[PDB]
Amino acid sequence: CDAFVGTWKLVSSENFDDYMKEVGVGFATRKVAGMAKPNMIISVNGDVITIKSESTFKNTEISFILGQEFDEVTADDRKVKSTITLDGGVLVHVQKWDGKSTTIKRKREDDKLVVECVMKGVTSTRVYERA
């Protein structure tokens, strides 16, 4: 992926609290995480893709190669096994932990970067625009 490269600012969020609740996130974290308006910085160097998230809540970073499972510590401190692939221009990220999973799709749509986060029956949509 590389039409994803850039700096992106959160401009809208739907159902994020519900998503965090479903994932198992404690209330105090949800309160701070849900108010935050992160920047996401995507860069690519050969086959390594780097996704940074920066906010008043927490900074995080993952670097990965498509199709290679890796250990991820999430912003809420879950230790998950993550696999990210590129599927019709959509970055498909699955996190697996304790026999559970969540799926995070990052897609380009017009000039927006759209993030869809799915946990059980909950779907949260987060839209970012170029900073």
Interface residues toward ligand B1V, by CB under 6 A = 20, 23, 25, 33, 38, 53, 57, 74-76, 104, 115, 117, 126
The residue whose two tokens read 């108010």 is 35
> Token pair of 3, please?
């039409």
- Report whether 73 belongs to an annotated binding site: no
- What is the closest distance, in whole angstroms, from the C-beta atom of residue 92 to ligand B1V in the complex? 12
- Report whether 92 belongs to an annotated binding site: no
Which among 23, 2, 9 has a CA at the least distance from the CA of 113?
A: 9
Kindly tell me which of 4 and 57 has the beta carbon lying closer to ligand B1V. 57
For residue 19, the Cα-to-chain-centroid distance in whole angstroms is: 12
- Report whether 19 belongs to an annotated binding site: no
For residue 85, the Cα-to-chain-centroid distance in whole angstroms is: 13
- What is the closest distance, in whole angstroms, from the C-beta atom of residue 126 to ligand B1V in the complex? 4
> Token pair of 110, please?
């017009």
- What is the closest distance, in whole angstroms, from the C-beta atom of residue 74 to ligand B1V in the complex? 5
